[PDB]
Design an enzyme around this catalytic site. Sequence first.
Site, PDB file in Angstrom:
ATOM      1  N   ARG B  49      48.589  39.464  33.784  1.00 34.56           N
ATOM      2  CA  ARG B  49      47.939  39.316  34.807  1.00 34.56           C
ATOM      3  C   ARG B  49      46.467  39.280  34.512  1.00 34.56           C
ATOM      4  NH1 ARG B  49      44.899  43.285  38.267  1.00 34.56           N
ATOM      5  NH2 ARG B  49      44.480  42.376  40.337  1.00 34.56           N
ATOM      6  N   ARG B  90      30.180  40.574  51.728  1.00 33.34           N
ATOM      7  CA  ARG B  90      29.097  41.515  51.247  1.00 33.34           C
ATOM      8  C   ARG B  90      27.726  41.247  51.968  1.00 33.34           C
ATOM      9  NH1 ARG B  90      29.894  41.355  46.208  1.00 33.34           N
ATOM     10  NH2 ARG B  90      27.787  40.752  45.165  1.00 33.34           N
ATOM     11  N   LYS B 238      49.532  38.548  48.110  1.00 35.51           N
ATOM     12  CA  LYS B 238      49.217  40.029  48.223  1.00 35.51           C
ATOM     13  C   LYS B 238      48.827  40.571  49.493  1.00 35.51           C
ATOM     14  CE  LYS B 238      46.070  41.086  45.257  1.00 35.51           C
ATOM     15  NZ  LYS B 238      44.738  40.943  44.404  1.00 35.51           N
ATOM     16  N   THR B 296      49.462  48.833  43.261  1.00 39.65           N
ATOM     17  CA  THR B 296      48.305  49.549  42.732  1.00 39.65           C
ATOM     18  C   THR B 296      47.994  51.022  42.353  1.00 39.65           C
ATOM     19  OG1 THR B 296      47.244  49.625  45.118  1.00 39.65           O
ATOM     20  CG2 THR B 296      46.512  47.598  43.520  1.00 39.65           C
TER      21      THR B 296
END
Lengths: 493, 492, 491, 489
Positions: B49, B90, B238, B296
């Site tokens: 990955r 952000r 995902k 994860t």
Amino acid sequence: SQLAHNLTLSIFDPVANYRAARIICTIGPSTQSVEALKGLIQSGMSVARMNFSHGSHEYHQTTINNVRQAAAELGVNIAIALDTKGPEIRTGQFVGGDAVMERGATCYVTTDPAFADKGTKDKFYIDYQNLSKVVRPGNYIYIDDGILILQVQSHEDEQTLECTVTNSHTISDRRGVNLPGCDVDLPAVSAKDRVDLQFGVEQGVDMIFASFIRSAEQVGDVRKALGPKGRDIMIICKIENHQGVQNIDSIIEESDGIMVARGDLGVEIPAEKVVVAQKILISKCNVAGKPVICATQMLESMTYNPRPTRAEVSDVANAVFNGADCVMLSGETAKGKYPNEVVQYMARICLEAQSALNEYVFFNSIKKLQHIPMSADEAVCSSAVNSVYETKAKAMVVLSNTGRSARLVAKYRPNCPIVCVTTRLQTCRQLNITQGVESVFFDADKLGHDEGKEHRVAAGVEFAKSKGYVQTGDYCVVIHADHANQTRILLVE
Amino acid sequence: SQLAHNLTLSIFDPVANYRAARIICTIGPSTQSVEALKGLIQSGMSVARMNFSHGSHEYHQTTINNVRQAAAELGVNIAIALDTKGPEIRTGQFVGGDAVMERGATCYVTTDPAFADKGTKDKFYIDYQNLSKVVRPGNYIYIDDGILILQVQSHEDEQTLECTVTNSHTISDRRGVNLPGCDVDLPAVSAKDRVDLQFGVEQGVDMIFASFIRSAEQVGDVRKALGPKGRDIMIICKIENHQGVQNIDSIIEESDGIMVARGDLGVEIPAEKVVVAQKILISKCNVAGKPVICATQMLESMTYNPRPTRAEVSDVANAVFNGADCVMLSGETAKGKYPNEVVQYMARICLEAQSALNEYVFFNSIKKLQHIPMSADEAVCSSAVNSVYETKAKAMVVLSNTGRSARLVAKYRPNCPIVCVTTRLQTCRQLNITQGVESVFFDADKLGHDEGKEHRVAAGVEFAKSKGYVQTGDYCVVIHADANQTRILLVE
Amino acid sequence: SQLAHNLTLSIFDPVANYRAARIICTIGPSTQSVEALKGLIQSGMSVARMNFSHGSHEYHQTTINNVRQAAAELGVNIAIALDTKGPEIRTGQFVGGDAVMERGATCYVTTDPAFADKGTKDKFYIDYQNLSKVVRPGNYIYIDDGILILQVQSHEDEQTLECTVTNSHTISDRRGVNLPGCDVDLPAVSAKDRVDLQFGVEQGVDMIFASFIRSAEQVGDVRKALGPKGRDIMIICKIENHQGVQNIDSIIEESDGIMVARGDLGVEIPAEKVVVAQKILISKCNVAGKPVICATQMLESMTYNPRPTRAEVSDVANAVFNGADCVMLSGETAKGKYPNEVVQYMARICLEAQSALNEYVFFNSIKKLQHIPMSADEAVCSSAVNSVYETKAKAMVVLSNTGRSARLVAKYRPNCPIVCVTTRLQTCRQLNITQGVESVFFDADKLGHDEGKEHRVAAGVEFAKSKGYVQTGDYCVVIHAANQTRILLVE
Amino acid sequence: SQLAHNLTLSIFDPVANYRAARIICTIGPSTQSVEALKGLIQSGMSVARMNFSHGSHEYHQTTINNVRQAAAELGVNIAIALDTKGPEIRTGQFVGGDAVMERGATCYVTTDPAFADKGTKDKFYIDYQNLSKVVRPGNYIYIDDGILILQVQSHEDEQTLECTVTNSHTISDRRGVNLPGCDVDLPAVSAKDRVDLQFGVEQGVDMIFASFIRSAEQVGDVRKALGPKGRDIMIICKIENHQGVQNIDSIIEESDGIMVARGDLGVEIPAEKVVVAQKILISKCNVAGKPVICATQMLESMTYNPRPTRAEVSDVANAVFNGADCVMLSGETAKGKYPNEVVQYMARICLEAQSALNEYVFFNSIKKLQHIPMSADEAVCSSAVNSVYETKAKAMVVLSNTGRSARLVAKYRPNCPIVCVTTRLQTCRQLNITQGVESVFFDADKLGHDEGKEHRVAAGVEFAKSKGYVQTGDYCVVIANQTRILLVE
């Protein structure tokens, strides 16, 4: 299960005309001619039974020739079965060739060879040398087709028995005797049978309905009698007494199928029990994967009457519900007044019975009984029939030369027609006693070896289309099982 | 069920040397060299990955080249995955490159572009132009790895929000922000993503791990970004937020697989629910017949320690018990101190978990869910796996060119290895995320189109022999779905 | 199965406020005061565990008194468990009360009694006299809580072993030793245990958590040590090594329950195996109808951190998914910085795990495993739980005085709360380790003997009502095992 | 399945001398005396059927009195059933009391009342006034027990129909007619039935065998005819034609049971389809929990012969295998030459059939069919029978006063005798048509109100114990609600 299935049914719906059960007809005086045979074939006959306990070889040769012609003319394949006479206990002779038995009076049954001609109503002979033994006091001795009934009460000596004549009846020379509940020890194949069996082999019959089988060893004797040139003939064992019923597991093991002779079983076993025995023997054959025939006193009253009784109709239906591969007709077709009508009525009952039969119960029940791990072909045939249920396929095509695979697939009971494509014409005839199958002959000499099987698959599918089982767009499950493994789910074009 | 199966097990028995689960490793500084990659392969890596949220095209180009070389020399096929950065939120810049937030204080977060470089602890920028119309009073705004949390209270204007600093924390320039419970509307694929995906297609990656997927519609956007030249690349979605979880059925429908990003989901959902979410998403993918990756914080502590915790070990085992096709390693292999050891330990846990897994439960649960009548393929693959259980066959050989059949067969969970024989090398790589399958490449240009399937079947059987799955005398189930076909062979 | 069930779930639906799993907390400094205990009870504690491997009889007497008071004040019944120290193997003394072990160093351990004080870093004593014979070359010897590891390689004579110090570590006098994979066939109850168990019986503890049970014979030894006055105390066997796992079937047979000590099992068995072992022991206990406790290293980091790790959260959830009756906390409550928070978080995870658990699978699974025929009791409890599933009943009321029936009914896993009405207060305490049950005490000396069970049934239904399980109109299944079952229409 | 079960059987081992199926006997000239009735009871009769289509109220009063006394004398409870005559479509009279019909010949069938006596082979009457409007061309008209078949071709007018005689047959005065594919709106309770039913109520009969039920509303008419004083009498609907078969679901719904009249159904339906109809109706009643009777032409040849045919024996056995509660005898006992022998043979066949019957299949099937959630009663009876299978209990004791519970428990088919303890003697008689149950009368007036059911349970157990069903150490399942598993002391 089935109870649930019955709730969803209705008799006012159209009966999808496909009949899985097969009909065996006994040939005789009212059905031996070619024209009478074609009528029988057109009425629903799949197997022609020759009762060898009567008639000469020239008589049966005529039946054999006429069946093969009637079949040829109509373009079908009909199986030919030779029903054996089997062992038989006949009495000695009488002075004046007669002996008037009367009700309540006494007589004596001796194992003495000297009375083989000195027979009188007071004392006569019986050729079963193990008489004073297997026969106890209180037992019964049936003489002359079971009409005369004697009742043992003691043994005069090691050879003679004292009996009471329970009913008046006159008996002539050498007339058969029966011993209810007594374990007799007669040989399987008699001298007459041995001669008839060699004739059957020479004439190429497809199967033998072996009379009075009571032992797995007896089946072996029938094989030997057929010899090496008759290694491909099927041996259907007729279960006609308590021993046959007791040793049923081993007999089924050795044989190529079973015949439930209700009437014969009824001679020494209570009617209500014979009913239950029929259920047992049929279920055991079903699990074994071998053809089983429900055989005697079927649509009995139709032998002279144009219509059967209420009860006879249900009897035929329930034989199908029990799981019988074939249903049989004896005197109804042999000496009957309505040969074609009985067969037609029988077929009609089988068709109706089938519409109500829940075949998924059989499939499921036969799956649960399988031991794990199982062999390749066992697993392939179940999965193929499983796919039929999953995809709701309308037909199955089985490429089987010996008919082994076709018979194994049929064991699982798919809810659709099974079409067997063989290179052997005898397979086409032998599969006539296996329920829910139809054979298509593929000529390897006239159409080539078909090394690749596509032509045979095409033939099977074309037959299925021809009969209206599958249309363009439908699903058809195809198989090839032993001799070496393959399954396809085809989209019919 | 699994209960009854557990009663017959024993930890003293020998583990049947075979692992169905697959391991995905994130490549980084600790593992980019070809020698480090070889060691990752020898340890148990099936997929490499590339985390594109960092690194340039030359950096990832090196990973691509080194993976191919490491695989080539070792004689295997390793899949290459491009993990997308996805849309990002952000803050802007600050005066003095800093802004000391203090508990209980009041601040203003705005969408006005003028406050890009003028940010202060009292008022600063956030590049998500819809921030005001999506966020509601009472909601929370997480900034800088979710460390700083402010709680919105009202709207100053049509660009500014009044917030309370719920905890003291100092934040520097342009730090990421998260909007718990908020229905973000950002485009499925961002700018950089569009550029990165066109690079992935040019370099021939096998799959995309698409970040922050929320709608089925978004999968379609990724498909298009890949264009016609990338129609064969798989899109693994995902699931990182509540919307992805809510629309999971339709997302699974359009995608080629799913990745359960536990940590990302954990930003706005209570840990205990993420656990349950993991069970749901895995089971749904299992039924769908599409690969699912547990992703994860796996063997987390082994990044710096030679040994994991007892809890980390059970987490990996349960991912397998749940039904995950693959388990993933991120920082453990990317920047970790024990790259090979983590992969080895992970593989060991998967092998052990497998010995205890009752695959018949999966098979019969999957069979029970199919609708009658079913399609031919569906019926063939189940019957084929049924035969495996019936005959207790030791291997299956599936001739699949696109990997469709191999993936369908694997869905039924046979209790034996599945060997796929393909004429496509990319299928060999893509099947690396499907549990319990191993691919054998058959070169149709250098061997013949093998019409009749005899050579390919032989190849699959030989492979099964060479790995010791079957010996002469053994049964092996062979399949070909799209003509249909199934066989139970006797091994020689 | 669970698969088909997972498809229908949504983490966005409201969870029920019914928690079937039970929480056991180890009492210690952080939690011994009657104020700290009531906080533990309000957080979710059902059983108070006393770790007898440390602390005096007076220390534990305080815990016993404070637990009974805390419980009395909050009007509940809390079980008291005495966790046994069990046999232990430990080194002799050293010259200067110390011995600095170093990496590489070649030392010798001796079964020779003469070195019981003549200990030095080169040669020292170990009180397990079958040491030299049992321990072979290649094996490991763990000393001082498993910190110091030593690998044996040869025999000097018939009492001494030559070892290599695999890691540097300093050890003082009498520190415990462990023999990984070695069949150290030490006794069931040690002298110390025999004294502690005598104390437990005098103080009326509800159960014993018997340490290091290796065989079915050993359970008998514990039952003997408790004597006739302690015949009603439950013996929960702690499975801590490979022997306990091998002989698990016979151990479960003779015990009243099992505890899966993961950390202890982890000393000699690989972690991944311990996971699988946990599944096996739990399922076996489930089928047997005896309580099983998932016991060590649960929510570890919450000992000093206000929040646990992701992995710790899943570990707790999966213990419930496995079928555990209870989950346990050791240091988290004993010396932890967040006693109440850990228990609260643990309860939260168990409630969430339960909402996703498909109990019909368990029911189906236990019913299938039943041999045909079965006893009346067995048949009644299944049919009662069967009726629960059939009528979608919202509660079950079980009249059980010893708790036997309640435990048998609970085995079948009904998807509704089980309310047990007992005339014994100890049954109320003991049932605290059985998942999905709640006890109602019926004071027979103050209310009468209630033959015909009318008043008791009413009490059980009243509790179910007051708890919000059943409302007028719902069905409630009542049972008593002389057999009897009712499907009561609630008023 | 039953397949699996058949493999384990053997006709050579024992048969628990226990018979679950019940036998209904039609009383007549050869079985009306008190002595003949006692012989019928000893042979196996549970229900005495009175065919009201022939004989006066005085003739049937004798049957009622003789049955009561024969039963009293033996110490048993026998049910009394009144089989209704029902509605009937006959033809009118003929000139010379005859009319020779011949093949191909055209005739006219009319509704005109004037031809009620002027009938000829050319044109005759039929008392069903809506005939022309109900019938259509192409349809068939069966006359004289279905022997003569005529085919409608056209409407001559609003009262007459032109028909073709499809087969030669001579018919005399007022003979019955059947309309094979036509829906008949005839009144449920004729004037004669109305009178007979009130007589039945006055004499306290236990059940009515309602003739020719074609619709649900018709059952309601029979209830209205019985009135309030007969609200406890059971109404067993005789399904004798295609409409009754078509509306079977709703008819079963309103009735208290069903009777499959095979011979009557056979007039208009092909024999092979009547067989399948029998399976359907029986299974439907089984699921419904209401008694079903296999009714006509059973052991028929034994009306003259000392032994039945092969086929008759299997017919009786298969009725049991189908799931019938009762099997019936008509002429075999009413005018037969061997009353006792037929009943004895029938019982013998039922006993044998039972030994082979796999009752688990019934229990299991019914369980897969129940709805979830279910009512308390439903759930309790299934669990109680479940327990029987689980513990291999050898008897069940059901305390039921109306017989409703006993009938619900019996629906689940436990593989052991069911003993019902009632405080009502009529329940003892009515349960005589429910398979596998036996009633024990508990006299509340000369023993107590037994609030607590202690004494009743004991009575049921002693009966089971005395019948040899259970002994000390056996499990017995007993069944406001409650279920118990006992250890027989």
